[PDB]
Ligand binder design. Structure first.
Ligand code: ZNI
Ligand code: GNP
Ligand code: MG
Lengths: 168, 165
């Protein structure tokens, strides 16, 4: 049977974790704000000519429950760490997610992609240069996305699969 | 200021489950109480009648009140789209507490939740404005149709609602 990959989408409230995931799974943009509790999705795709089953966990960006994230970080195989290019706080929050995943998995070596989302917006508050450096500091890719236009969406998820595939 | 009483008649897939009544603490949060009272009577020409409990998480709470979008994103107050947090005098002390849902500070609309346990981490963030008077067993029965992430396994509706006192 096709290989499964357990992907986990994390980041601050409202950065567009759900809009990215639903663009990938359902090919439409959620314009409304439905803050997540926790959702899972399954999708079969072909990446680099190998079929695989994506299990995607869309997590809550509620800072109140930062302690509840450990259990899903233990089970996840790869992480999309998402910030919004118009939310410098969400970009600051990337460090915390990265450090929590590293701590919970007890490893420097966890498949991860840094995602800068909402790149359709006219104004950015985060310097693409800063995100590039941070990703370089972590040894992970950085992908710019728009869940609105679908720009970079497949690239973000498929790049994370390639990161897991290389780790395996 | 006297605390009014309102009721919901709850249905499961269009079948009657039973009645929940609420004391609204108009004596502590009159603005928040009056919003819920008027949405329960429908006297402004809109309100809770026909809306669903979109989120039911057993061991925590039952959330509803989106009568504008019916998808968990909507709802509105009798004062406009949103109103301020009136105060946090009342706390989430245990089952039956009735409290305002929100999307952060001063974003009260119509969405509300009924606690089925103490949720003290919501203290100072959500405005408590009432408590179940009769039919806590109906709120417990609503947990039959909930899940870990709150998606309901049957459609839980406010088939009727109004004021008793
Ligand atoms: C981390 C998982 N997880 C948990 C949670 C947490 C815990 N704990 C926390 C506390 N620990 C004690 C100190 C020791 C024990 C373990 C255990 N297990 C769980 C669940 C079952 O694991 C999946 C929660 C929870 C809550 C959210 C996101 C994830 C959450 C969340 C997202 S949005 C929101 N919260 C506020 C929301 N806003 C809107 O809906 C906005 C929509 C848009 O604009 C109008 C409308 C709102 O107002 N309410 C009205 C109020 C109850 C609230 N929803 C809600 O649903 O809380 C769910 C729940 C279960 C109570 C909390
Ligand atoms: N312009 C624009 N808006 C976006 C984009 N992605 C998401 N949004 C908008 O930002 C808001 C929040 O998106 P959402 O996917 O719910 O974010 P989230 O990170 O899942 N939130 P949460 O942590 O609460 O679950 C929505 O109104 C959504 O339409 C994007 O790429 N561009
Ligand atoms: Mg989300």
């Amino acid at each position: 049977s096709m290989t499964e990959y357990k992907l986990v989408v994390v980041g601050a409230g409202g950065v567009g974790k759900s809009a990215l995931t639903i663009q990938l799974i359902q090919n439409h943009f959620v314009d409304e704000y439905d803050p997540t509790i926790e959702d899972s999705y399954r999708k079969q795709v072909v990446i680099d000519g190998e079929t695989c089953l994506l299990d995607i966990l869309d997590t809550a960006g509620q800072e109140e429950y930062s302690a509840m994230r450990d259990q899903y970080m233990r089970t996840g195989e790869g992480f999309l760490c998402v910030f919004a290019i118009n939310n410098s706080k969400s970009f600051a929050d990337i460090n915390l997610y990265r450090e929590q995943i590293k701590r919970v998995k007890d490893s420097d070596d966890v498949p991860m992609v840094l995602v800068g989302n909402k790149c359709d917006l006219p104004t950015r508050t985060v310097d693409t240069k800063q995100a590039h450096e941070l990703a370089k500091s972590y040894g992970i890719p950085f992908i710019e996305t728009s869940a609105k236009t679908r720009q970079g969406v497949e690239d973000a998820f498929y790049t994370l699969v390639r990161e897991i595939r290389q780790y395996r | 200021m006297v605390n009014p009483t309102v009721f919901f008649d709850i249905a499961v897939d269009g079948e009657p489950l039973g009645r929940v009544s609420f004391e609204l603490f108009a004596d502590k949060v009159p603005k928040t109480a009056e919003n819920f009272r008027a949405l329960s009577t429908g006297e402004k020409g809109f309100g809770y009648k026909g809306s669903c409990f979109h989120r039911i998480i057993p061991g925590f709470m039952c959330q509803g009140g989106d009568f504008t979008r019916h998808n968990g994103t909507g709802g509105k107050s009798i004062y406009g789209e949103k109103f301020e947090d009136e105060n946090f005098i009342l706390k989430h002390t245990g089952p039956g507490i009735l409290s305002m849902a929100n999307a952060g500070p001063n974003t009260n609309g119509s969405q509300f939740f009924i606690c089925t346990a103490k949720t003290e981490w919501l203290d100072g963030k959500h405005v408590v404005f009432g408590k179940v008077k009769e039919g806590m067993n109906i709120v417990e029965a609503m947990e039959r149709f909930g899940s870990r992430n709150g998606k309901t396994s049957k459609k839980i509706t406010i088939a009727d609602c109004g004021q008793l006192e």
